[PDB]
Symmetry: C2
């Protein structure tokens, strides 16, 4: 049973990690690259990039705990807790060599602590379209004069009394289409068919709840990162962001400069939050070229 | 039938204003005071102040267009459009003398333009618990280190695709309780019965939509006010705000200093957003005394 179609030559499998069964899709040969998705999506957001990378790398794309076909975390949903699961999964497949990491949106929240605590395990790093949890997130506006506030949903999703789950239950397909398109520049790529696939996955009751638990743990993640950030990242790093509606623009690189010694950034014009789908050609090229600077 | 119990000595009635049938509750004798409610509520939020005020004044408390038992506006929901209805309603009852105005929450948005454009018609002004729409609103944060922020709902309510109506329909009582209590210090003043009454009113499909249309017009109101605010307010003005959880604290008076030449303010410790209910006795006292400095 698969929620999304596996690309030719890839396998859908599971690995138990600290008592949590994680789902992932894997293919290719060579040094390992792990691709970590974000909110509203699953491993599938990577399905176009995966075959291209698999010509040079072993590629693994997991579902975040609780999302897609992965069981919820047994510890918690803060960045440091979730990162343990992802670090251990990657190291099962690359126990004696560093691996590459690509993360989108909350995939960043869930990987940053394991990158900073295990720097020698991370060869190259690509982060796109979300702030690393820190005090900067408290400076984003609730309401804007033009366009729409990028992160008002942080408060919605974090609210007590299971506000978001209670409102969104039974309306997952409607909500996800609005959420995705409102954060996009190239909305046309989100066909009803694709939206149906994503909606069916996050509408699983435990997945809808897990989605919001990441946001309920966000302040804890900020507190965790205040300590961890005392050590800068030393590996080559690339940031990507959309310059269109829904994009983070210059924020992504500007924040990362406070975290990394070796960083280059790109802002992709006419692209919003959903880079792998809205702007597949230029995004895939940037990622493939950047990772191919290392051995492959 | 009435959505809310009318106080003894008061009358529930209707007037046509520019083709729109407005509901109001009226009582007392002497100069006119109009009391204007805000989001999530109706004329009834004034029901404790009304009897006391009616000892010295003629008191009218209308339902905002589309809310309570008032017809939706036929022009629009921007501050300038709505203010026309309320100004003309007041003038039906006070054609020969200026009247006093007390407004709470979005009642401010819906009255400011008629106050600044008809200053000779306004004897004294009391504003509580919401910014006059201006560039200040764009500085409020989307998220806080303690959880959900004060005005993330501006974005939720302003969102297109009828986001708020779609998610809240069927869950109106649930949502309103969370909303009210999340903006309150004294949650206990909101009995289950009171929440039932307010929830049944705004759950009317046209009222649920009307509620959010005020926010969908907020940026337009900000732009309208940018021109209007070139003329300062000259009448005696008082601001009130809550000093506790949910309250705006010093913001209310500090903003009003930029609009009004003659202003005094108070911050009420231990009170949140809903002054008339959370802190009825002290709020009532401050209003009655301020308005009684004039002729009654």
């Amino acid at each position: 049973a698969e929620e999304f179609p596996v690309p030719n030559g890839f396998e859908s499998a599971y690995r138990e990690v600290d008592g949590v069964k994680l789902h992932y899709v894997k293919g290719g040969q060579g040094p390992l690259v792990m691709l970590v998705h974000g909110f509203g999506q699953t491993w599938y957001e990577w399905h176009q990039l995966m075959p291209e990378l698999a010509k040079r790398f072993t590629v693994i794309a997991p579902d975040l705990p609780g999302l897609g076909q992965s069981e919820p975390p047994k510890t918690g949903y803060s960045g440091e807790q979730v990162a343990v699961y992802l670090h251990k999964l990657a190291r099962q497949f690359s126990p004696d060599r560093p691996f590459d990491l690509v993360a989108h949106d909350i995939g960043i929240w869930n990987t940053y602590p394991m990158v900073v605590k295990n720097q020698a395990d991370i060869a190259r790093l690509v982060y796109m379209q979300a702030p690393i949890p820190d005090a900067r997130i408290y400076r984003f506006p609730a309401f804007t004069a033009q366009g729409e506030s990028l992160v008002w949903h942080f408060s919605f999703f974090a609210a007590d009394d299971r506000l978001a789950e209670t409102l969104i239950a039974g309306k997952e397909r409607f909500f996800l289409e609005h959420f995705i398109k409102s954060h996009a520049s190239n909305t046309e790529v989100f066909s009803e068919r694709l939206l149906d696939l994503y909606a069916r996955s996050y509408a699983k009751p435990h997945s809808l709840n897990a989605s919001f638990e990441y946001y309920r743990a966000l302040n804890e993640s900020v507190r965790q990162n205040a300590e961890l950030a005392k050590t800068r990242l030393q590996m080559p790093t690339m940031t990507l962001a959309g310059g269109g509606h829904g994009g983070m623009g210059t924020f992504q690189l500007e924040q990362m400069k406070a975290y990394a010694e070796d960083v280059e950034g790109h802002v992709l014009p006419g692209c919003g939050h959903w880079l792998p789908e809205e702007c597949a050609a230029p995004m895939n090229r940037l990622v493939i070229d950047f990772l191919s600077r290392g051995r492959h």
